[PDB]
Amino acid sequence: GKLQDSLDAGVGNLVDADLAKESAKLQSLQTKQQLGVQALSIANQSSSSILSLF
Amino acid sequence: GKLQDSLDAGVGNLVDADLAKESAKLQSLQTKQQLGVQALSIANQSSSSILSLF
Numbered sequence A, B: 001g002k003l004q005d006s007l008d009a010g011v012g013n014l015v016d017a018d019l020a021k022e023s024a025k026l027q028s029l030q031t032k033q034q035l036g037v038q039a040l041s042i043a044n045q046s047s048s049s050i051l052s053l054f
Helices: A002-015 A019-053 B002-015 B019-051
Strands: none
Touching (some): A019 B019
């Protein structure tokens, strides 16, 4: 029984993720995605300024 | 008659338990069991703290 518990703990050490770090990574990536969307939206508009020259 | 009495006394010396110590160990182990149940119940709650971070 003790050996089976040790094997289960070892599997958990191998594959289980640390959700506390993921809680910060998620919010950081959401903010980064919003700024990326806004930057691409600003980038789309570059051609519109040429109309002013004619 | 005396020899049979001595044989019975020797058997009792070999196998009979000393209940005076058992009376103390019983209460000590009941307290130990209560604390073990409470400690395991505390340990079951480790996953609840993760929910607060999301």
